[PDB]
Amino acid sequence: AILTDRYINRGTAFTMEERQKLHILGRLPPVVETLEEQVARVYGQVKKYEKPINRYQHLVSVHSTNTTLYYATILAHLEEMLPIIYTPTVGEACMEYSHLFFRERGVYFNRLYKGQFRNIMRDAGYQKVEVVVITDGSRILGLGDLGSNGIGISIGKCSLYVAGAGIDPRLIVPVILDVGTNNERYLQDKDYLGMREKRLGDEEFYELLDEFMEAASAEWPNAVIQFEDFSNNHCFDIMERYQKKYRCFNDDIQGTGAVIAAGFLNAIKLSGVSPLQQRIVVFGAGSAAVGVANNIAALAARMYKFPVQDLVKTFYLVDTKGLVTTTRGDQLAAHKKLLARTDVSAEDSAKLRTLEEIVRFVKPTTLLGLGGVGPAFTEEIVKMVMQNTERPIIFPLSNPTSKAEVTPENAYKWTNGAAIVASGSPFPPTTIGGKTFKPSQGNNLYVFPGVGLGCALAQPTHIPEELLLTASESLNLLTTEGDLREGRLYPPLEDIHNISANVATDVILEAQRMKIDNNKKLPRTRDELLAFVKKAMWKPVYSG
Amino acid sequence: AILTDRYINRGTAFTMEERQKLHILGRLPPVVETLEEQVARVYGQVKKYEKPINRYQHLVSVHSTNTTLYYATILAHLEEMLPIIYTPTVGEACMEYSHLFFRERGVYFNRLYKGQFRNIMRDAGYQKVEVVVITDGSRILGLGDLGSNGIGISIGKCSLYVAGAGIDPRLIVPVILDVGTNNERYLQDKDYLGMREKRLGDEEFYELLDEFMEAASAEWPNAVIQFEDFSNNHCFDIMERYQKKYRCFNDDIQGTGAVIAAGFLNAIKLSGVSPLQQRIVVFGAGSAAVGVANNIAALAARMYKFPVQDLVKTFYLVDTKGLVTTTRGDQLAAHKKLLARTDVSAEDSAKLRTLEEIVRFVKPTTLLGLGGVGPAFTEEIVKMVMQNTERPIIFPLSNPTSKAEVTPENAYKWTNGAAIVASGSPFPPTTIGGKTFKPSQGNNLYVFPGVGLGCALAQPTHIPEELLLTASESLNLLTTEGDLREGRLYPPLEDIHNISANVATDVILEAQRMKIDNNKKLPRTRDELLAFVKKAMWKPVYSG
Ligand SMILES: COc1ccc(NS(=O)(=O)c2cccc(NC(=O)c3cc(F)cc(F)c3)c2)c(F)c1
Ligand SMILES: COc1ccc(NS(=O)(=O)c2cccc(NC(=O)c3cc(F)cc(F)c3)c2)c(F)c1
């Protein structure tokens, strides 16, 4: 019976004497293993499988039998497991293997349960819930509507809070708000188990998501609510609607920008071109891309007290028409007006349409790739940036690797190793003339876990932009002299527990300064708080 | 919590009103399905996977979440699921994916636990256990020693008692007696969890298996003990040691022969060549092959009261030297002397070495393939049998299909549809000149489940050869006039519950006649007993 409880089961780690005492002698094969030995064994069982999706299926089975062993395996092989346990494998599992999520602790909402949301939460019988991940399966990148099968996205994200910040796996809740699906295959699929209708309109959407926030705030009062993988028609509006009234954030919007800003300011430090001397092409002019630019400006203003207006003038925003300027004779979308050039004539605007001529005119020191239109950063463009700086900063952030603006390999080759590169995705190192270069991956894992752990300990009334900026700065400052010497823009991913504890500490101190913190038991000075935060984290080791 | 109990979990079959009452509204996606709908959905999830081993892995996951749904899926698609849930996929799962068995209810014995066997059984906390499958992983066919990974063979076989005869899945126990392994890969594999030593010698082997039988007889007194997949050096000796003192049998030896005999007597009925007019080449002279011949003789003697001596003279036994005769000038192994020809000269014996000349001399009406040396039944041999009978009986029983003596397709083609064929393995039908022929598969599933259900109800003191013969005859008699008209040698496999109930009834009546039955509550007349046996079977339907 202890064997059948995944939270306390140790499998072959139960000693002979423990097996005799627990009456489980003969329920296990005779070999006794340490946790490290069980991890090496699982890692081999995983690499037996060739397909990401079968590796995932194997790890799901470990998770349902031995939760400690699962999280211990992830933490020993984090960089390699991350693309299997979340993006992009988790989406493929949701889309075509949703049965992998059936036995997990999801909470399912829909219009049929209108007015019962709070009873459904009370009935789940969870104690002091710390983190709730919710999706409607609409997808941030707008591809492959998963409807009800979105529950797997919430399950995978909840697992990254546990692995990344030692949120107790008993105190995380994955939610699907099923407001229907526009997935035509699913609408006609006899085996789709969700609401078989097109996505509700906005008024009914917000009636249900309002009830969910109010029910969660009453029944899970200690929880952080994190919006995952909501489509662009809703994700920005959801934060505007809830950010002040509930303890909530959106990792896709706020996490991404905090991690990219941290990495970019370290690229500036390495580049020899100080923040006010940077000329930054922002290739892509969506709301997300502009939010990342603004996050960069906000962090450089916090860390260096340059006037934010002067930081904004380092940005050269490029949409599908070309360089965004006040003189090019169109009515600009609201988000584009802030970053619009005021220093460019109508006549020059007309000659600044293709990325190549924009780069030749602007003479940038940085290329930020947020475009999602393939390999726009060509050899010619990259060799033009080498004319403006000894250390071109090149960030191909468009997902997946096929949408990327340039490969890190070409960035390094074309610059003879001078390029400073951050990627959305992991890449193998590149060796040029005996010298090795590897891009810095700005993974969202750097920030959301520590925001979750900080907000779980501090119990703030809400999560204002100040806490995200603090988490951005905290992450920047964790890149050591030694990391920076080796060209790293972030502390190492494998150190995620120490990263999360430090992000959490800084978030807590910021909540304490703003007096929005509801937990008065916490220390109020950084050294003592950091020790207290570390002690509070759940660890994937056998404890009893 | 009801959802997390695989025995009572109904998943999406819980109605809306049931979900509200059980407080699980919002723990499931909103679609409500019947069991039949859940089965169709699972069957599609299974056929999504291309590889037998991934289909198995999928079915294992269903089994660990919803036991009723698992057994309902097997019974709806039995013929197609059988090669996935047992031979040959179960062996490949044991050999390379033993982690699939970790979460199942195995009991593990080894020399380290000597003298504790009964405490290990008492600690398992099972109530009125009916069926125990035990293996040591040595393998009947002597290939791929699995050691401790043999537990998966016991697990799969236990599952066939539940599916086949409605043994309650709570009342079956899979056992591995780990007496070491001769698998060199495993002896050197850091991840082998069993006893890391060569197989114990016979004296220590029997010390441990003795303690197991005595402990099982005391702690699981109502159980049938069935030996599965033991190597030829032990399997015959084990039955000789235990058959009278304990309630036990070996499916590989006794099950096989009872099913082959049933099918062969139906082939005789269809062939127009009555039992005393049959001339049977037994291609293969191992103990198993001779036991099958003797099972045939024993059944024809029971059903027809021909003198058994006259039935024995229909057999022409062929070993690696050639036709087994009293005059060929070697000292015959004991098992070969009974079937030795007394009517063949030393001079003819010398000219009867190759199967071709043996067939030309003997002029057989039947070829029994138990040889395990590939496709020995050639076009020439098959067309020679067409000279001796209008309906050649051709049974290629050697496993797997590559060791088989002939394909059913060639048997039918070469005889223009006249051949009466039984196979070890399923084959697709063959169409010749617009007429369709399909071989009869003599699956062991026809007999062991009903022997298990009969011995579970009757609680006989032991399982004498009389009960196996009765089960053989019972199975023969279940092939209806209609089945026989269509060329079927066995009732249909999909009817396995009715088959098992009828086999069980006949086994019980035989135990009652021999006064070895310990359960006095049972009816003693066939019609009333059969109704009572049917009522007692566990059914894979939702009941509460
Ligand atoms: C893919 O799933 C995996 C699960 C566990 C492990 N490793 S392990 O070391 O946890 C282990 C090793 C071998 C056997 C057990 N057995 C059990 O945990 C067990 C549980 C039960 F609920 C009832 C039971 F009888 C026995 C565990 C694994 F590598 C894969
Ligand atoms: C491969 O495994 C399968 C398992 C179940 C089904 N079908 S089903 O109809 O049983 C079903 C359908 C959808 C969801 C649930 N959920 C649960 O059974 C469940 C259990 C728990 F222990 C806790 C929990 F919160 C929920 C079940 C399946 F096709 C595959």
Side-chain angles (χ1 to χ4, degrees), chain A residues 96-118:
Chain A
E96 306 294 352
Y97 306 83
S98 64
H99 62 255
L100 296 167
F101 300 107
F102 287 177
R103 84 148 84 239
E104 299 314 313
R105 47 152 64 192
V107 187
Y108 296 74
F109 299 102
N110 57 61
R111 73 171 174 82
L112 298 175
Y113 309 153
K114 178 176 182 103
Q116 308 181 59
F117 283 18
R118 210 219 159 143

mmCIF file of all heavy atoms in Angstrom, chain A residues 96-118:
data_model
loop_
_atom_site.group_PDB
_atom_site.id
_atom_site.type_symbol
_atom_site.label_atom_id
_atom_site.label_comp_id
_atom_site.label_asym_id
_atom_site.label_seq_id
_atom_site.Cartn_x
_atom_site.Cartn_y
_atom_site.Cartn_z
ATOM 1 N N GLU A 96 -2.268 14.319 -29.930
ATOM 2 C CA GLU A 96 -2.445 12.947 -30.492
ATOM 3 C C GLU A 96 -2.398 11.830 -29.428
ATOM 4 O O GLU A 96 -2.750 10.682 -29.799
ATOM 5 C CB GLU A 96 -1.361 12.631 -31.530
ATOM 6 C CG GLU A 96 -1.225 13.646 -32.648
ATOM 7 C CD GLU A 96 -2.418 13.740 -33.573
ATOM 8 O OE1 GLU A 96 -3.323 12.887 -33.447
ATOM 9 O OE2 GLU A 96 -2.450 14.683 -34.401
ATOM 10 N N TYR A 97 -1.996 12.090 -28.185
ATOM 11 C CA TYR A 97 -1.872 11.071 -27.114
ATOM 12 C C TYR A 97 -2.458 11.587 -25.800
ATOM 13 O O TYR A 97 -1.875 11.279 -24.762
ATOM 14 C CB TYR A 97 -0.418 10.655 -26.895
ATOM 15 C CG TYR A 97 0.262 10.188 -28.153
ATOM 16 C CD1 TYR A 97 0.814 11.098 -29.031
ATOM 17 C CD2 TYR A 97 0.344 8.846 -28.465
ATOM 18 C CE1 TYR A 97 1.418 10.685 -30.210
ATOM 19 C CE2 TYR A 97 0.953 8.410 -29.627
ATOM 20 C CZ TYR A 97 1.500 9.335 -30.503
ATOM 21 O OH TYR A 97 2.077 8.914 -31.662
ATOM 22 N N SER A 98 -3.590 12.295 -25.839
ATOM 23 C CA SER A 98 -4.235 12.900 -24.631
ATOM 24 C C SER A 98 -4.505 11.865 -23.539
ATOM 25 O O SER A 98 -4.692 12.256 -22.341
ATOM 26 C CB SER A 98 -5.498 13.655 -24.968
ATOM 27 O OG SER A 98 -6.499 12.797 -25.479
ATOM 28 N N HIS A 99 -4.574 10.586 -23.891
ATOM 29 C CA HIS A 99 -4.792 9.497 -22.905
ATOM 30 C C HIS A 99 -3.647 9.459 -21.885
ATOM 31 O O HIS A 99 -3.895 9.016 -20.766
ATOM 32 C CB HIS A 99 -4.994 8.154 -23.598
ATOM 33 C CG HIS A 99 -3.812 7.738 -24.393
ATOM 34 N ND1 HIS A 99 -3.784 7.813 -25.782
ATOM 35 C CD2 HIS A 99 -2.647 7.202 -24.015
ATOM 36 C CE1 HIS A 99 -2.620 7.382 -26.216
ATOM 37 N NE2 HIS A 99 -1.918 6.992 -25.149
ATOM 38 N N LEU A 100 -2.492 10.041 -22.206
ATOM 39 C CA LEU A 100 -1.331 10.090 -21.265
ATOM 40 C C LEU A 100 -1.648 10.930 -20.016
ATOM 41 O O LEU A 100 -0.944 10.746 -19.009
ATOM 42 C CB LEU A 100 -0.100 10.598 -22.011
ATOM 43 C CG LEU A 100 0.364 9.666 -23.124
ATOM 44 C CD1 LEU A 100 1.377 10.358 -24.023
ATOM 45 C CD2 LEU A 100 0.876 8.347 -22.562
ATOM 46 N N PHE A 101 -2.701 11.758 -20.044
ATOM 47 C CA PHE A 101 -3.044 12.756 -18.994
ATOM 48 C C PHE A 101 -4.244 12.330 -18.168
ATOM 49 O O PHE A 101 -4.526 12.973 -17.162
ATOM 50 C CB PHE A 101 -3.257 14.113 -19.673
ATOM 51 C CG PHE A 101 -2.014 14.547 -20.399
ATOM 52 C CD1 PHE A 101 -1.951 14.523 -21.785
ATOM 53 C CD2 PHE A 101 -0.904 14.976 -19.693
ATOM 54 C CE1 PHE A 101 -0.798 14.887 -22.448
ATOM 55 C CE2 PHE A 101 0.246 15.370 -20.364
ATOM 56 C CZ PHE A 101 0.285 15.358 -21.743
ATOM 57 N N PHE A 102 -4.923 11.252 -18.577
ATOM 58 C CA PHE A 102 -6.175 10.764 -17.970
ATOM 59 C C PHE A 102 -5.972 10.577 -16.458
ATOM 60 O O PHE A 102 -6.840 11.020 -15.704
ATOM 61 C CB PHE A 102 -6.662 9.501 -18.714
ATOM 62 C CG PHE A 102 -7.227 9.767 -20.096
ATOM 63 C CD1 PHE A 102 -7.641 8.716 -20.919
ATOM 64 C CD2 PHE A 102 -7.395 11.069 -20.565
ATOM 65 C CE1 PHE A 102 -8.207 8.968 -22.159
ATOM 66 C CE2 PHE A 102 -7.931 11.318 -21.822
ATOM 67 C CZ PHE A 102 -8.341 10.264 -22.616
ATOM 68 N N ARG A 103 -4.877 9.951 -16.030
ATOM 69 C CA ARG A 103 -4.713 9.522 -14.611
ATOM 70 C C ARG A 103 -4.147 10.664 -13.744
ATOM 71 O O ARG A 103 -4.029 10.448 -12.523
ATOM 72 C CB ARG A 103 -3.876 8.244 -14.557
ATOM 73 C CG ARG A 103 -2.368 8.438 -14.580
ATOM 74 C CD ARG A 103 -1.666 7.348 -13.782
ATOM 75 N NE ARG A 103 -1.459 6.130 -14.565
ATOM 76 C CZ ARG A 103 -1.933 4.922 -14.261
ATOM 77 N NH1 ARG A 103 -2.674 4.720 -13.176
ATOM 78 N NH2 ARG A 103 -1.668 3.914 -15.076
ATOM 79 N N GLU A 104 -3.865 11.844 -14.316
ATOM 80 C CA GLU A 104 -3.255 12.982 -13.562
ATOM 81 C C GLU A 104 -4.349 13.810 -12.870
ATOM 82 O O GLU A 104 -5.494 13.693 -13.239
ATOM 83 C CB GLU A 104 -2.443 13.903 -14.469
ATOM 84 C CG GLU A 104 -1.265 13.226 -15.155
ATOM 85 C CD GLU A 104 -0.400 12.352 -14.267
ATOM 86 O OE1 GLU A 104 -0.001 12.768 -13.124
ATOM 87 O OE2 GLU A 104 -0.136 11.248 -14.730
ATOM 88 N N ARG A 105 -3.983 14.696 -11.957
ATOM 89 C CA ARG A 105 -4.968 15.380 -11.068
ATOM 90 C C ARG A 105 -5.595 16.640 -11.713
ATOM 91 O O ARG A 105 -5.897 17.595 -10.978
ATOM 92 C CB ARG A 105 -4.302 15.709 -9.723
ATOM 93 C CG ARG A 105 -2.926 16.357 -9.839
ATOM 94 C CD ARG A 105 -2.554 17.272 -8.673
ATOM 95 N NE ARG A 105 -2.433 16.583 -7.390
ATOM 96 C CZ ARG A 105 -2.345 17.193 -6.198
ATOM 97 N NH1 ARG A 105 -2.356 18.522 -6.109
ATOM 98 N NH2 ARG A 105 -2.266 16.463 -5.092
ATOM 99 N N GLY A 106 -5.958 16.645 -12.988
ATOM 100 C CA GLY A 106 -6.577 17.845 -13.602
ATOM 101 C C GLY A 106 -7.921 18.278 -12.970
ATOM 102 O O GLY A 106 -8.648 17.443 -12.360
ATOM 103 N N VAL A 107 -8.264 19.567 -13.102
ATOM 104 C CA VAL A 107 -9.608 20.110 -12.799
ATOM 105 C C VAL A 107 -10.159 20.711 -14.091
ATOM 106 O O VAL A 107 -9.416 21.434 -14.764
ATOM 107 C CB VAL A 107 -9.574 21.138 -11.670
ATOM 108 C CG1 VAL A 107 -10.984 21.542 -11.281
ATOM 109 C CG2 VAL A 107 -8.790 20.607 -10.478
ATOM 110 N N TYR A 108 -11.342 20.253 -14.485
ATOM 111 C CA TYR A 108 -11.999 20.533 -15.781
ATOM 112 C C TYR A 108 -13.189 21.447 -15.500
ATOM 113 O O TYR A 108 -14.036 21.099 -14.670
ATOM 114 C CB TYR A 108 -12.481 19.233 -16.413
ATOM 115 C CG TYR A 108 -11.407 18.254 -16.798
ATOM 116 C CD1 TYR A 108 -10.731 17.522 -15.840
ATOM 117 C CD2 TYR A 108 -11.075 18.073 -18.120
ATOM 118 C CE1 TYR A 108 -9.768 16.605 -16.193
ATOM 119 C CE2 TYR A 108 -10.076 17.203 -18.490
ATOM 120 C CZ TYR A 108 -9.457 16.440 -17.534
ATOM 121 O OH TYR A 108 -8.486 15.591 -17.918
ATOM 122 N N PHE A 109 -13.221 22.600 -16.148
ATOM 123 C CA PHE A 109 -14.334 23.566 -16.116
ATOM 124 C C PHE A 109 -14.883 23.719 -17.527
ATOM 125 O O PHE A 109 -14.170 23.552 -18.541
ATOM 126 C CB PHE A 109 -13.878 24.897 -15.506
ATOM 127 C CG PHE A 109 -13.388 24.807 -14.085
ATOM 128 C CD1 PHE A 109 -12.027 24.805 -13.803
ATOM 129 C CD2 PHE A 109 -14.274 24.707 -13.026
ATOM 130 C CE1 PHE A 109 -11.578 24.716 -12.497
ATOM 131 C CE2 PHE A 109 -13.813 24.627 -11.721
ATOM 132 C CZ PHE A 109 -12.476 24.641 -11.459
ATOM 133 N N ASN A 110 -16.171 24.048 -17.577
ATOM 134 C CA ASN A 110 -16.921 24.308 -18.821
ATOM 135 C C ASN A 110 -18.229 24.988 -18.431
ATOM 136 O O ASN A 110 -18.570 25.024 -17.179
ATOM 137 C CB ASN A 110 -17.124 23.036 -19.646
ATOM 138 C CG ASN A 110 -17.822 21.935 -18.879
ATOM 139 O OD1 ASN A 110 -18.953 22.129 -18.440
ATOM 140 N ND2 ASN A 110 -17.161 20.785 -18.710
ATOM 141 N N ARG A 111 -18.943 25.473 -19.433
ATOM 142 C CA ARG A 111 -20.241 26.180 -19.254
ATOM 143 C C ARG A 111 -21.300 25.261 -18.622
ATOM 144 O O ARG A 111 -22.196 25.763 -17.970
ATOM 145 C CB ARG A 111 -20.700 26.709 -20.608
ATOM 146 C CG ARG A 111 -21.202 25.637 -21.561
ATOM 147 C CD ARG A 111 -21.813 26.350 -22.747
ATOM 148 N NE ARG A 111 -22.172 25.356 -23.736
ATOM 149 C CZ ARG A 111 -23.285 24.626 -23.711
ATOM 150 N NH1 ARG A 111 -24.180 24.794 -22.761
ATOM 151 N NH2 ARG A 111 -23.477 23.710 -24.632
ATOM 152 N N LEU A 112 -21.186 23.938 -18.754
ATOM 153 C CA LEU A 112 -22.207 23.036 -18.172
ATOM 154 C C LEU A 112 -22.171 23.169 -16.653
ATOM 155 O O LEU A 112 -23.189 22.827 -16.011
ATOM 156 C CB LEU A 112 -21.949 21.593 -18.618
ATOM 157 C CG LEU A 112 -22.030 21.363 -20.128
ATOM 158 C CD1 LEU A 112 -21.644 19.923 -20.469
ATOM 159 C CD2 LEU A 112 -23.425 21.697 -20.631
ATOM 160 N N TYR A 113 -21.026 23.591 -16.086
ATOM 161 C CA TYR A 113 -20.815 23.623 -14.610
ATOM 162 C C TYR A 113 -20.934 25.050 -14.087
ATOM 163 O O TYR A 113 -20.591 25.296 -12.915
ATOM 164 C CB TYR A 113 -19.475 23.012 -14.203
ATOM 165 C CG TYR A 113 -19.188 21.640 -14.770
ATOM 166 C CD1 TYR A 113 -17.886 21.226 -14.961
ATOM 167 C CD2 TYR A 113 -20.186 20.759 -15.142
ATOM 168 C CE1 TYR A 113 -17.576 19.981 -15.487
ATOM 169 C CE2 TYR A 113 -19.896 19.513 -15.683
ATOM 170 C CZ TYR A 113 -18.584 19.123 -15.876
ATOM 171 O OH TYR A 113 -18.279 17.890 -16.392
ATOM 172 N N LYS A 114 -21.433 25.957 -14.910
ATOM 173 C CA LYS A 114 -21.609 27.371 -14.536
ATOM 174 C C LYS A 114 -22.296 27.426 -13.171
ATOM 175 O O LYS A 114 -23.302 26.774 -13.003
ATOM 176 C CB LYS A 114 -22.396 28.104 -15.621
ATOM 177 C CG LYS A 114 -22.679 29.570 -15.316
ATOM 178 C CD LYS A 114 -23.381 30.304 -16.450
ATOM 179 C CE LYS A 114 -23.616 31.773 -16.160
ATOM 180 N NZ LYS A 114 -22.650 32.653 -16.865
ATOM 181 N N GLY A 115 -21.714 28.167 -12.239
ATOM 182 C CA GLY A 115 -22.222 28.418 -10.882
ATOM 183 C C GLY A 115 -21.769 27.364 -9.906
ATOM 184 O O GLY A 115 -22.086 27.506 -8.724
ATOM 185 N N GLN A 116 -21.087 26.311 -10.374
ATOM 186 C CA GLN A 116 -20.627 25.203 -9.499
ATOM 187 C C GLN A 116 -19.087 25.253 -9.350
ATOM 188 O O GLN A 116 -18.535 24.296 -8.758
ATOM 189 C CB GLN A 116 -21.063 23.834 -10.039
ATOM 190 C CG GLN A 116 -22.557 23.688 -10.371
ATOM 191 C CD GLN A 116 -22.888 22.292 -10.876
ATOM 192 O OE1 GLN A 116 -22.677 21.292 -10.194
ATOM 193 N NE2 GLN A 116 -23.414 22.195 -12.086
ATOM 194 N N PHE A 117 -18.410 26.268 -9.903
ATOM 195 C CA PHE A 117 -16.921 26.286 -10.028
ATOM 196 C C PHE A 117 -16.342 26.115 -8.621
ATOM 197 O O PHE A 117 -15.467 25.250 -8.398
ATOM 198 C CB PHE A 117 -16.405 27.518 -10.778
ATOM 199 C CG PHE A 117 -16.553 27.496 -12.287
ATOM 200 C CD1 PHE A 117 -17.432 26.625 -12.917
ATOM 201 C CD2 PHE A 117 -15.779 28.328 -13.092
ATOM 202 C CE1 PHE A 117 -17.513 26.583 -14.299
ATOM 203 C CE2 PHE A 117 -15.895 28.309 -14.471
ATOM 204 C CZ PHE A 117 -16.764 27.432 -15.081
ATOM 205 N N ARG A 118 -16.856 26.883 -7.665
ATOM 206 C CA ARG A 118 -16.349 26.838 -6.280
ATOM 207 C C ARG A 118 -16.583 25.453 -5.643
ATOM 208 O O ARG A 118 -15.663 25.006 -4.960
ATOM 209 C CB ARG A 118 -16.880 28.015 -5.462
ATOM 210 C CG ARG A 118 -15.887 28.403 -4.377
ATOM 211 C CD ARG A 118 -16.583 28.766 -3.100
ATOM 212 N NE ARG A 118 -15.705 28.659 -1.947
ATOM 213 C CZ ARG A 118 -15.751 29.503 -0.941
ATOM 214 N NH1 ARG A 118 -16.598 30.515 -0.988
ATOM 215 N NH2 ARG A 118 -14.937 29.351 0.088
#
